Amino acid sequence: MQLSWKDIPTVAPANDLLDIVLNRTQRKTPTVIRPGFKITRIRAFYMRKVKYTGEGFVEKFEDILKGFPNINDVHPFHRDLMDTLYEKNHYKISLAAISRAKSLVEQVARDYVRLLKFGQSLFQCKQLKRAALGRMATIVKKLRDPLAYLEQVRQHIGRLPSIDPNTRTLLICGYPNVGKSSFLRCITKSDVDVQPYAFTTKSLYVGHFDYKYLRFQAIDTPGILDRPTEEMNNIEMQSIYAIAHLRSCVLYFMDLSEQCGFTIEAQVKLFHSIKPLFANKSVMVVINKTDIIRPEDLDEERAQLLESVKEVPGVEIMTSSCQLEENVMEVRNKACEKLLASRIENKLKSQSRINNVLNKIHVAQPQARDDVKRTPFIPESVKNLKKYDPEDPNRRKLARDIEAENGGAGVFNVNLKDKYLLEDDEWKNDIMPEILDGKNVYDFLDPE
Amino acid sequence: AFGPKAQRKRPRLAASNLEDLVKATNEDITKYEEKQVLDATLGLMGNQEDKENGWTSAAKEAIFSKGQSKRIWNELYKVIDSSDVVIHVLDARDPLGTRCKSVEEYMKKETPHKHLIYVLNKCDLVPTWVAAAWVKHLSKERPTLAFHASITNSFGKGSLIQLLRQFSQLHTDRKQISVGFIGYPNTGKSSIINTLRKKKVCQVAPIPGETKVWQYITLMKRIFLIDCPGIVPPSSKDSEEDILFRGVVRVEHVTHPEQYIPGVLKRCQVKHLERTYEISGWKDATEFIEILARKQGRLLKGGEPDESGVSKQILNDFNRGKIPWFVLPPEKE
Amino acid sequence: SGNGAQGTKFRISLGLPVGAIMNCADNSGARNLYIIAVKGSGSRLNRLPAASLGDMVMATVKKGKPELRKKVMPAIVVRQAKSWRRRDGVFLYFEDNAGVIANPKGEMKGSAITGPVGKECADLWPRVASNSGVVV
Amino acid sequence: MGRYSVKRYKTKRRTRDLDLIYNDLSTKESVQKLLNQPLDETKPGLGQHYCIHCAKYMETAIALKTHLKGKVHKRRVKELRGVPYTQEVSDAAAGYNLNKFLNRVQEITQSVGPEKESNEALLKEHLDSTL
Amino acid sequence: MATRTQFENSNEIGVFSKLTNTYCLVAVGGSENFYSAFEAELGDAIPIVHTTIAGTRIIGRMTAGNRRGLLVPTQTTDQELQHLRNSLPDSVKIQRVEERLSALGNVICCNDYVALVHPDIDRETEELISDVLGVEVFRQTISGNILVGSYCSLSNQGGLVHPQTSVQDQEELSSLLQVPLVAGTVNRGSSVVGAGMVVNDYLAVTGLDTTAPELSVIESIFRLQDAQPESISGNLRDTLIETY
Amino acid sequence: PQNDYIERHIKQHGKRLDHEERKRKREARESHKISERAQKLTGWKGKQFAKKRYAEKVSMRKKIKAHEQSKVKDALPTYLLDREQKFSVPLPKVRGISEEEMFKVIKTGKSRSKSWKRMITKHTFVGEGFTRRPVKMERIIRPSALRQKKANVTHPELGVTVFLPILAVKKNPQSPMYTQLGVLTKGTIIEVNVSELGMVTAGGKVVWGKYAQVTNEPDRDGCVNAVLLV
RNA sequence: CUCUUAAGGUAGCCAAUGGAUUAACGAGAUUCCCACUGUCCCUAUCUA
Numbered sequence A: 001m002q003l004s005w006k007d008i009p010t011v012a013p014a015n016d017l018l019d020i021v022l023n024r025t026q027r028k029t030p031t032v033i034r035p036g037f038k039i040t041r042i043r044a045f046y047m048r049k050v051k052y053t054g055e056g057f058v059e060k061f062e063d064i065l066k067g068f069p070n071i072n073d074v075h076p077f078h079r080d081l082m083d084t085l086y087e088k089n090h091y092k093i094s095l096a097a098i099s100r101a102k103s104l105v106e107q108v109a110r111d112y113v114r115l116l117k118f119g120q121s122l123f124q125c126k127q128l129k130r131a132a133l134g135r136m137a138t139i140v141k142k143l144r145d146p147l148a149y150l151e152q153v154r155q156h157i158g159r160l161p162s163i164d165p166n167t168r169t170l171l172i173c174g175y176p177n178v179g180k181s182s183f184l185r186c187i188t189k190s191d192v193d194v195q196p197y198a199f200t201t202k203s204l205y206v207g208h209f210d211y212k213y214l215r216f217q218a219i220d221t222p223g224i225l226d227r228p229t230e231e232m233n234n235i236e237m238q239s240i241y242a243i244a245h246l247r248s249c250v251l252y253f254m255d256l257s258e259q260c261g262f263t264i265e266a267q268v269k270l271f272h273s274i275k276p277l278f279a280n281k282s283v284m285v286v287i288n289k290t291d292i293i294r295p296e297d298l299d300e301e302r303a304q305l306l307e308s309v310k311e312v313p314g315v316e317i318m319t320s321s322c323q324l325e326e327n328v329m330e331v332r333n334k335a336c337e338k339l340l341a342s343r344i345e346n347k348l349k350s351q352s353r354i355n356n357v358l359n360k361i362h363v364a365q366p367q368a369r370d371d372v373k374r375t376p377f378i379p380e381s382v383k384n385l386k387k388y389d390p391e392d393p394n395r396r397k398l399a400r401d402i403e404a405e406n407g408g409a410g411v412f413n414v415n416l417k418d419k420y421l422l423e424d425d426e427w428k429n430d431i432m433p434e435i436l437d438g439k440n441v442y443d444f445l446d447p448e
Numbered sequence B: 001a002f003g004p005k006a007q008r009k010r011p012r013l014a015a016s017n018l019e020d021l022v023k024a025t026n027e028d029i030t031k032y033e034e035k036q037v038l039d040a041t042l043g044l045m046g047n048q049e050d051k052e053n054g055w056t057s058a059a060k061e062a063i064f065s066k067g068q069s070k071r072i073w074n075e076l077y078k079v080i081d082s083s084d085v086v087i088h089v090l091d092a093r094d095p096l097g098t099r100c101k102s103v104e105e106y107m108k109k110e111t112p113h114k115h116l117i118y119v120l121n122k123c124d125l126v127p128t129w130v131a132a133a134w135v136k137h138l139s140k141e142r143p144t145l146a147f148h149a150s151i152t153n154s155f156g157k158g159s160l161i162q163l164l165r166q167f168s169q170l171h172t173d174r175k176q177i178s179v180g181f182i183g184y185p186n187t188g189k190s191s192i193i194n195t196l197r198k199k200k201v202c203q204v205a206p207i208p209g210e211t212k213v214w215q216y217i218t219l220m221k222r223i224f225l226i227d228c229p230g231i232v233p234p235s236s237k238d239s240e241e242d243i244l245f246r247g248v249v250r251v252e253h254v255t256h257p258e259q260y261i262p263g264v265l266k267r268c269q270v271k272h273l274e275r276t277y278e279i280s281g282w283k284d285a286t287e288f289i290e291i292l293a294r295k296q297g298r299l300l301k302g303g304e305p306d307e308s309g310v311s312k313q314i315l316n317d318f319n320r321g322k323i324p325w326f327v328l329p330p331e332k333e
Numbered sequence C: 001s002g003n004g005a006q007g008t009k010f011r012i013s014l015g016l017p018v019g020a021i022m023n024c025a026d027n028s029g030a031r032n033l034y035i036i037a038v039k040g041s042g043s044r045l046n047r048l049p050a051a052s053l054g055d056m057v058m059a060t061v062k063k064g065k066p067e068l069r070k071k072v073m074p075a076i077v078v079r080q081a082k083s084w085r086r087r088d089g090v091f092l093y094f095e096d097n098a099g100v101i102a103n104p105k106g107e108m109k110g111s112a113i114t115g116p117v118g119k120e121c122a123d124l125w126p127r128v129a130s131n132s133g134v135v136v
Numbered sequence D: 001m002g003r004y005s006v007k008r009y010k011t012k013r014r015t016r017d018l019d020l021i022y023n024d025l026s027t028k029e030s031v032q033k034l035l036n037q038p039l040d041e042t043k044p045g046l047g048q049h050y051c052i053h054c055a056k057y058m059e060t061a062i063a064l065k066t067h068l069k070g071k072v073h074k075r076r077v078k079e080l081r082g083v084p085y086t087q088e089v090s091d092a093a094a095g096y097n098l099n100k101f102l103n104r105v106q107e108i109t110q111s112v113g114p115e116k117e118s119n120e121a122l123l124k125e126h127l128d129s130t131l
Numbered sequence E: 001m002a003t004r005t006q007f008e009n010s011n012e013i014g015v016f017s018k019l020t021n022t023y024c025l026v027a028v029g030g031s032e033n034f035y036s037a038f039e040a041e042l043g044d045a046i047p048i049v050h051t052t053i054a055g056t057r058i059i060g061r062m063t064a065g066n067r068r069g070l071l072v073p074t075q076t077t078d079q080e081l082q083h084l085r086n087s088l089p090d091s092v093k094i095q096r097v098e099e100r101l102s103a104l105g106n107v108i109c110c111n112d113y114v115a116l117v118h119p120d121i122d123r124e125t126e127e128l129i130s131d132v133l134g135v136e137v138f139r140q141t142i143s144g145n146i147l148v149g150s151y152c153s154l155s156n157q158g159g160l161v162h163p164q165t166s167v168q169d170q171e172e173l174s175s176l177l178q179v180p181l182v183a184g185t186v187n188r189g190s191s192v193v194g195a196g197m198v199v200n201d202y203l204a205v206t207g208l209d210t211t212a213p214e215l216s217v218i219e220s221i222f223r224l225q226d227a228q229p230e231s232i233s234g235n236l237r238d239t240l241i242e243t244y
Numbered sequence F: 001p002q003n004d005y006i007e008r009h010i011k012q013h014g015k016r017l018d019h020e021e022r023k024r025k026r027e028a029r030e031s032h033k034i035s036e037r038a039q040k041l042t043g044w045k046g047k048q049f050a051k052k053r054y055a056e057k058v059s060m061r062k063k064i065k066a067h068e069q070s071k072v073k074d075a076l077p078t079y080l081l082d083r084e085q086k087f088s089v090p091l092p093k094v095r096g097i098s099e100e101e102m103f104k105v106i107k108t109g110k111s112r113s114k115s116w117k118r119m120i121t122k123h124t125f126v127g128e129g130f131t132r133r134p135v136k137m138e139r140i141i142r143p144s145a146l147r148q149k150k151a152n153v154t155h156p157e158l159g160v161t162v163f164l165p166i167l168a169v170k171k172n173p174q175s176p177m178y179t180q181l182g183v184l185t186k187g188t189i190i191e192v193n194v195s196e197l198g199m200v201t202a203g204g205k206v207v208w209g210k211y212a213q214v215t216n217e218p219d220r221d222g223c224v225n226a227v228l229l230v
Numbered sequence G: 001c002u003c004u005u006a007a008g009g010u011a012g013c014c015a016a017u018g019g020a021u022u023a024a025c026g027a028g029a030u031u032c033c034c035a036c037u038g039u040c041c042c043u044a045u046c047u048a
């Protein structure tokens, strides 16, 4: 999988592409031909014109065709997302139009070079070359609509978030205005907008975090309305496909204060309606906005509704408030634990990754072999050393600080003799002689 | 459909319900996983793993693209445009390997009035039942004649001549007919023409590509024969090993023939190889090459065996018919 | 000085032009390497690209594993027979030309290098230094 | 300088040095490893029929016998009879590491000398018996 | 007590540095950022010495030692040897060794008590190791891998071997070294762990590209933080299963 | 960044402090810039600039006309609405083409001393079952690249053009020799298959062959264009 | 009036051989390999 498609070159519109390719021919090929030249030279001149223009068009079309993803060969989550966003039928039809234009341009170039082989005069050769280029221009101008569509699609698809469907995922779902973007802001550093009106978020947003040295992604979705898929719209279909495809831990958010504009009965009904969506995935129901109302001081009928939500195996109810750091961290950790348990238990049922995992998990241990004492050695100065604080008024000045205050890196000349541990500190800047009368001083230098 | 002026807010073909939707998603995920396993058993184990190591395959040699030249195919289309009867010459050892299906389809589509027939040459290099079975199976599509081309001691010459006379009699109002010989290099087109003329009128050599331009030969007053250079139609399934073992390329211009010697071992019987080279006891191609080199005295300086030269000689023997081999014909029905 | 190299590289006398055969010093299974290109080599009319000690080349295997053959791979020159000058003040040379198979990042395919490795190459390529048993 | 010397003693046409051959001949285990080798196509005679003194592979047993019954091998053996001439000899000649050179000299005279001579005698009688 | 740094945008810390319990050696090349990365963790508690070995920067690969001694190859110059002697206190012996295998850091893997060595080192080099470094010496390969110094990272508390080491080899080496051993990687999948990191009893320095699970494995096996024993592999088993 | 991050950044942080004034002054300068371009651009760029200016002025005039026209204020069946679409020949006289222009001398021999071969330089129709004559007796050469099988035929009624297969060359106006050689030049009467036009006689017979006249020079434009004779 | 596709499991019948895929020879024409090298990288120096 690729997960990102920002490296698609710019798609020019039809007239711009025509201008680019034709002017490239006029600039990069020679333009002066004389009627008094040899007919072979004239024919070569115009054949080169036709072949070069065809090659330019084919190069542009090939850059278009290689850049765009193959929608039927990507992961099915990406296929469904791109079908919702760009209408896969139109997408494939436009790219097929590009392919057909490439084939037709190649055919025109070959046919008119073969025809130019038999040109008898400069006028006839010029007419044939102009005919070839005009037919190429007609073919290219037939592509005016697919090129506009593909340029818009390229710009939009370069900005999609990179979602790995085979990593660890916390999905966030529910009605609008229940706190989904607020929770994503709390747990990640995604900049998803938080506003007190419905459908502020119209697309999938991704954040990341680390739990037990493991990278987790978190998907915040647009809200879903309690409607059948027949009258569901594309914005909600993004969330539907996210929940259907991404194997994950789903967090269904409920606002019991009814500040979201939806009743608790409606939220329970939506949960029971999208119950078939999250099967064999981890499920948890998070009650947001506990600083306004709480499950414990609700009504009896509403408590019965929440119990009916809890009835579905094997979901669990947890309270949270997007102004409560400890509680949002706790619910994040519980969801991560459920997801990790599911993944590890699934891998426990497999036999492929067993022996290597055991080898890389086993810690070898020694046993006796002698009555010799071997203990770690930590110097007293080391264990009395104070921790270095980069942001502190009274901190030890480092060698890089001295370098920067003297000359900076690559200009500062360190004196390596300043660290010498000698009997006399006046001996530090002493030049040690090396040669005396054809003898190395060092192999004579010896005590006694 | 999409853009600033888009009016598509709902999917066109909505699913029935969430249960059908999740069933479809599970089916798609399973199909994707199975497809990934099937494609990664080959591609990711092969080409894509080399991209991590910065490795690139050796550049394809120009000797394997011989027979796909513009001059050669210009000659081919010239002789087809000039011919009334076209004789497609196949090798009796590998006729399906030596069939030019694209040229056959072009002839049956664009020029249906030209009569395409099969001549299965080099039938003396295969067992008689193999030649009979191949003739029977190819006769289900085209009139096929078994042949052994030789100026002095041939087979099938009278049958070919009487077939050509029948074609002339059918076209008795054309004042002459032309019979163009096409096929792979080294199938024996020039040898068949020499056999029909009972005289060496076209140059013949074991090396491929001896014939370069077309040649007119007057067989009878109303029958002309056209000699054409051999053609190798381009393809992607035809590997360099297949092309080399069809006798297409000149072996002296290949890089590492020791890499192709295992193909000889797979295509030849052990008893036939051991009878041809009077050696035995090898367990792989490298040991076979080394044993043959030491027996034949093909030593480099200091006593090292000349593996490349011995391998080239083995490939030449295989292609030129000093080692017996054939491809099994289709099973009898 | 090539991707993966550690720092700059002073000029060494060029010993191996394109088309030369050097030995393979690693334990990857190859026996010799045939130089087809020199990384970082400039362009001049009629002048052959040429490698010296510490350079990265693109090479093919002539003798060795049939799996390893018929592929173009990066290699790093670790010994050269053409004498070169050290800034400590001596000209020196090895008895043979030898390189080691590597990836584009200068990491070794093999795990050990047999024979001495030049100081210049070992200092330029940390993985060569890590897999060297003898650095001059 | 001249063509003969250049094309014989070129850098790429080098042969094994006398001190290396002395170290190969010093111990019986080295003699055994050099005499008993796996069959290797890259060496003449499949790595068999190898003269340790000349450090040279012959193609056949009769070729090795003829080489041994010749003056070239005798010249090599007489060259190897003496001190192997390490760098310590040149240092001592300059007056450098003299005690180290004297220690090496007495070790050669006492330990490594007679054992190498006995190994040479055993190798010679083995070659005579097997040839 | 495991930090991450680079020497001029390179992850191979052990190539350019040497860390023992009583001193540290750093290559002189470039700025003072590498020296200050070591100095922020060590202070003026132990000597940190800029050095060159035969004019090269590969000092961890060219040198070997422990808290009691330092061995340098025969290619070291007298001036470099004198600079090392003047910078280091008399409690650490310094010896230049005439050895065919000059990359002493590659061919010798040692701590204060034991030393695995290349199986083809000289007997006098072995005796010099046992004398200057004051350790037991064993000739070993790490699952068939010579250059034990580059393919092992060792301290007095534990050891990290290259991940292709079998469990039986790990058991034999653990019984020889009298420390726990784990197989793992450093610098995002590199097998050359001894040349990827430097470690002593209270500090580890790895490359910047080392990941969180690798850092956790390193901290656990070398027992760096007080609340980090060597048997918390049972607690990190989930993350290790996920990562592997 | 993800989704419409630049739009969100403008919504959250604004633009550069001088953005509006800078854009306003650039738009004010545009008139001087246009005049300077028109008087300063040379060569191909100047010609293209003038052409584009004329097109823009025409389009603006059309838009003004449409606005003012809006401000001033075939009998098809139900299943077809909301669905869109003498005996003198049209070319009684065409340019005469000599044998010198029509044919090209092809020299043969090692020293190129024999010049009996001729090559037709125009497009030809050879018909079904064409086989090249033996080269020893091939005087007139019609190269295969110049052979034609189909033509763009336009029906004067209903205003459509169809790619139709050619059946025969009825009359080349230059010469009956060019007629029998099948030369396709301007004014040539050809027979074309009109099966896809769906023509039926008053007696009920389906018409699948009619006459057309070539209206172009195929040797100049690479294709045969013809008008049906109805 | 009629004609061709009966042949079958890695070498057959029928008459040592089933051949010109002809040894040897050649200032005949051509391809490749080892060796070798100032042909070349890239030129320098010496003699008459």
Ligand SMILES: Nc1nc2c(ncn2[C@@H]2O[C@H](COP(=O)(O)OP(=O)(O)O)[C@@H](O)[C@H]2O)c(=O)[nH]1
Pocket: A175, A176, A177, A178, A179, A180, A181, A182, A183, A193, A194, A195, A196, A197, A198, A199, A200, A201, A223, A288, A289, A290, A291, A292, A320, A321, A322, A323
């Ligand atoms: N009092 C209170 N308000 C909240 C809490 N969580 C979210 N909100 C408010 O709910 C409004 C909409 O929340 P939002 O993040 O847009 O939810 P979303 O539309 O489902 O993604 C915001 O203006 C928040 O101020 C909470 O825990 N307590």
Ligand SMILES: Nc1nc2c(ncn2[C@@H]2O[C@H](COP(=O)(O)OP(=O)(O)O)[C@@H](O)[C@H]2O)c(=O)[nH]1
Pocket: B121, B122, B123, B124, B125, B147, B148, B149, B150, B184, B185, B186, B187, B188, B189, B190, B191, B192, B203, B204, B205, B206, B207, B208, B209, B210, B211, B230, B321, G021
């Ligand atoms: N055994 C045998 N060899 C043949 C036969 N026909 C041709 N050859 C050989 O095949 C080689 C190539 O013959 P050639 O006529 O030049 O093939 P071309 O490329 O198709 O013209 C020559 O060496 C011939 O001796 C045959 O019927 N039997």
Ligand code: ALF
Pocket: B184, B185, B186, B187, B189, B190, B205, B207, B208, B209, B210, B211, B212, B228, B229, B230, B231
């Ligand atoms: F088809 Al050829 F020589 F290969 F005539």
Ligand SMILES: [K+]
Pocket: B185, B186, B204, B205, B206, B207, B208, B209, B210, B211
């Ligand atoms: K041939």
Ligand SMILES: [Mg+2]
Pocket: A180, A181, A182, A193, A200, A201, A221
């Ligand atoms: Mg939201």
Ligand SMILES: [Mg+2]
Pocket: B189, B190, B191, B202, B203, B204, B210, B211, B227, B228, B229
């Ligand atoms: Mg031929």
Ligand SMILES: [Mg+2]
Pocket: C045, C046
């Ligand atoms: Mg040149």
Ligand SMILES: [Zn+2]
Pocket: D051, D052, D053, D054, D055, D067, D068, D072, D073, D076
């Ligand atoms: Zn000898």
